[PDB]
Design a protein around this ligand. Structure first.
Ligand code: NA
Ligand SMILES: [Zn+2]
Lengths: 182, 6, 13
């Protein structure tokens, strides 16, 4: 395959609770995609041009625990379901796609890379439907073009009877539009 | 179609 | 109102 991924855990349940409370995370950061957790749920952030982007429905208005204490969001767009923190030192920052490809790859929290065909500005179909359970906890994950650049971040699954056949996503252009208006 | 936030 | 926490990462190839 072209694009491949693996994950590495860094913190367990106890570490997560404490870190949530102190807002201070001293762990080394690495990787293009951060696996995030609050008290109640898990999701992903994709690092694009120095900013960690994720979904508002996961992060709300919360700070991100960091090496110098809590990191305030620098972009918050409720209607777009989009938030961003400045990326901590160590994060591998990706580049937006400029090739316009409609052949996408979605990266899940399990580090699977799955084929998506773009069907609209914010919608792609899954070439092979999956149980929605497989996609839970993956909101905020990148949709990449064949060159591995960011087209968008995964927002919600379009499902029938617990089966996801398509995904709604936030185009990498919305990130731009949010940063302008700010 | 159900829209399910993930 | 606690912070979001990084509990893992994903490395791409
Ligand atoms: Na993998
Ligand atoms: Zn591209």
């Amino acid at each position: 395959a072209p694009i491949t991924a693996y994950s590495q855990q860094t913190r367990g349940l106890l570490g997560c609770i404490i870190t949530s409370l102190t807002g201070r995370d001293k762990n080394q950061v690495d990787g293009e995609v951060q696996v995030l957790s609050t008290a109640t749920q898990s999701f992903l952030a994709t690092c694009v041009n120095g900013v960690c982007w994720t979904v508002y429905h996961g992060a709300g208005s919360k700070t991100l625990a960091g090496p110098k204490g809590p990191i305030t969001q620098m972009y918050t767009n409720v209607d777009q379901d989009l938030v961003g923190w400045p990326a901590p030192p160590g994060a591998r920052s990706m580049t937006p796609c400029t090739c316009g490809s409609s052949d996408l790859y979605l990266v899940t929290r399990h580090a699977d890379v799955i084929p998506v065909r773009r069907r609209g500005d914010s919608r792609g179909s899954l070439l092979s439907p999956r149980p929605v359970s497989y996609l839970k906890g993956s909101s905020g994950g990148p949709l990449l073009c064949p060159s591995g650049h960011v087209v968008g971040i995964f927002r919600a699954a379009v499902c029938t009877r617990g089966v996801a056949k398509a995904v709604d996503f936030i185009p990498v252009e919305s990130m731009e539009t949010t940063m302008r208006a700010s | 179609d159900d829209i399910v936030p993930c | 109102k606690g912070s979001v926490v990084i509990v893992g990462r994903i490395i791409l190839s």
